Design an enzyme around this catalytic site. Structure first.
Site: not given
Ligand SMILES: OC[C@H]1O[C@@H](O[C@H]2[C@H](O)[C@@H](O)[C@H](O[C@H]3[C@H](O)[C@@H](O)[C@H](O[C@H]4[C@H](O)[C@H](O)[C@H](O)O[C@@H]4CO)O[C@@H]3CO)O[C@@H]2CO)[C@H](O)[C@@H](O)[C@@H]1O
Ligand SMILES: [Cl-]
Ligand SMILES: [Ca+2]
Ligand SMILES: [Zn+2]
Length: 509
Positions: A180
């Site tokens: 993205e």
């Molecule tokens: O380490 C700190 C903390 O982390 C917690 O877990 C997190 C994690 O850090 C975070 O990076 C992860 O991100 C997800 C995000 O929530 C999710 O929405 C996203 O989804 C996108 C995707 O990137 C696509 O490209 C596009 O935009 O669509 C989808 C959505 O439909 O992906 C991200 C990861 O790549 O989320 C987790 C959970 O919150 C730990 O839980 C905690 O214990 C740690 O302390």
């Molecule tokens: Cl994009």
């Protein structure tokens, strides 16, 4: 009594169904055929030490999340690329034929796992290592974590050295140009604060592709992994789109045209797969069908059942800003394929992230089965669902194609002509295996919400079918269960009544 005719001709419109359309991004309770290491966390992933940054998803924290979430054994946490080798090892162990690994292009990757990166630490800073596509010096299997750079071709070399190249049975077949890009300034402002320009994206895409193919000429390059329609159209109002986009209907065309131009100048194909993300904007009952949708909302569930039609049906106009204002670009798959035919013939198409919602509801399962049938029928090359193991009906939708009997039974790999007289209340997809119609596979979906639907089948085949075994899922359970076989087939015709909201896989022999 709702009656629908299904007409199949096993000798007509034969086309291969790519085996890689039944994939996932996450670890699912389903047999999948492709695994993608991608998404927000992969943009800042440093293969040298496995650290990565959450970006806006979690206070721009640089940490060991991918090692933890990926289940990497602690003793391998400091081993280069352990996040990726664990990912691919798991895929290989599950007999997954295609692994897609995201490479880094936004510009920088986590230098450490020390926590939140402040705005004052925006790259470049001690918190980051600069990414360079080509090392320009001998590769090492023990990369230097002390210098200021991380090299993508050296990363690929490490993987090819361990698994063989993409042409081999265990090689990683594809690499993605980050994730993205039009959202880099939103999701990863500490890495790439400025809104990406069309020129920047093309330059990076061409440079990274060249770097990768010098190491593995058989690897397929996927790009641009666009987040959604606005990026498909204008790369999210890219700063230079007013000039770069002159003469182009949308960014998709510009991307294909410029990648073809670069490939023609270089002497080899640099873009193998046009890669986009498609999260339906379709609404029903006052809400989008995905992202927080309420499974109790019947109108939303009904809209979810029809939404797959936006992918292929010219007569279907969904309730969304895309359906309202972008009709010239719908149905979406034909428009993307038309662009490929016009600007870079031979390029494949992949939907690397998607989710129709209602994952734990029968309509999420029926929509998933419908989407997979469409991907196969219209020629999509690879697809990977984005969502976790709690989407039991989405998983049933996948298994209906990949492992319907619990012992490896799967849908055929050659699509054949199969038409329904009512595309609103039903969907039907048929296939055979290779060039042999001895066994005819039919995915039959009844979208009727509260009444059964009677289907009258008429089949043209070189074989005379005598029995049709059936496997299905419904509101009673997302577990796919074998049903009573169809036995009264007269001259390849039979009638089969399916209960409301049921997804079936019929195997005729
Ligand atoms: O380490 C700190 C903390 O982390 C917690 O877990 C997190 C994690 O850090 C975070 O990076 C992860 O991100 C997800 C995000 O929530 C999710 O929405 C996203 O989804 C996108 C995707 O990137 C696509 O490209 C596009 O935009 O669509 C989808 C959505 O439909 O992906 C991200 C990861 O790549 O989320 C987790 C959970 O919150 C730990 O839980 C905690 O214990 C740690 O302390
Ligand atoms: Cl994009
Ligand atoms: Ca380094
Ligand atoms: Zn599950």
């Amino acid at each position: 009594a709702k009656v629908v005719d299904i007409r199949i001709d096993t000798s007509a419109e034969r086309k291969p169904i790519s085996p890689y359309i039944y994939g996932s991004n996450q670890e699912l309770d389903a047999t999948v055929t492709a695994k993608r290491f991608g998404g927000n966390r992969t943009t800042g992933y440093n293969w040298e030490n496995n650290f990565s940054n959450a970006g806006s998803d979690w206070l721009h924290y640089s940490d060991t999340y991918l090692l933890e979430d990926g289940g990497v054994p602690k003793g391998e946490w400091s081993t280069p690329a352990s996040v990726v080798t664990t990912f691919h090892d798991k895929a290989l162990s599950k007999n997954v034929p295609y692994t897609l690994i995201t490479l880094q292009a936004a510009g920088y990757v986590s230098a450490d796992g020390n926590g939140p990166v402040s705005q004052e630490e925006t790259a470049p800073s001690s918190r980051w290592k600069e990414v360079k596509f080509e090392k320009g010096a001998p590769f090492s299997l023990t990369p230097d974590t002390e210098d200021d750079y991380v090299y993508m071709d050296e990363f690929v070399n490490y993987l090819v050295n361990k698994y063989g190249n993409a042409s081999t049975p265990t090689g990683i077949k594809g690499y993605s140009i980050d994730n993205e890009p039009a959202l880099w300034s939103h999701t990863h402002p500490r890495i790439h604060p400025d809104n990406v320009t069309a020129k920047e994206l093309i330059e990076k895409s061409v440079a990274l592709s060249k770097a990768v193919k010098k190491v593995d000429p058989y690897a397929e390059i996927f790009g641009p992994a666009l987040y959604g329609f606005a990026a498909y159209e204008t790369l999210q109002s890219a700063p230079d789109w007013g000039t770069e986009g002159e003469g182009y209907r949308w960014f998709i065309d510009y991307y294909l045209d410029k990648m073809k131009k670069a490939s023609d100048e270089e002497g080899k194909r640099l873009l193998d797969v046009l890669d986009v993300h498609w999260y339906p904007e379709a609404r029903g009952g006052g809400e989008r069908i995905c992202f927080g949708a309420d499974p109790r909302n019947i109108e939303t569930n009904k809209a979810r059942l029809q939404a797959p039609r936006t992918l292929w049906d010219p007569t279907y106009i969904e309730d969304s800003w895309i359906g309202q204002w972008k009709k010239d670009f719908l149905p979406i798959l034909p428009n993307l394929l038309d662009s490929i035919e016009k600007y870079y013939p031979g390029t494949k198409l992949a939907i690397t992230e998607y989710d129709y919602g209602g994952g734990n509801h029968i309509t999420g399962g029926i929509a998933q089965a419908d989407v997979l049938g469409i991907f196969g029928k219209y020629g999509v090359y690879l697809a990977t669902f984005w969502g976790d193991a709690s989407n039991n009906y989405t998983e049933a939708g996948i298994n209906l194609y990949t492992n319907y009997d619990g012992k490896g039974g799967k849908f055929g790999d050659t699509s054949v002509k199969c038409e329904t007289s009512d595309i609103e209340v039903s969907s039907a997809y048929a296939s055979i295996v290779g060039e042999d119609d001895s066994k005819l596979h039919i995915i039959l979906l009844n979208k009727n919400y509260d009444q059964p639907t009677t289907f009258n089948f008429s089949i043209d085949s070189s074989k005379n079918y005598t029995i049709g075994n059936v496997w299905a899922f419904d509101r009673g359970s997302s577990n796919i269960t074998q049903r009573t076989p169809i036995v009264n087939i007269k001259d390849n015709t039979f009638t089969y009544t399916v209960p409301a909201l049921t997804a079936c896989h019929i195997v005729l022999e």
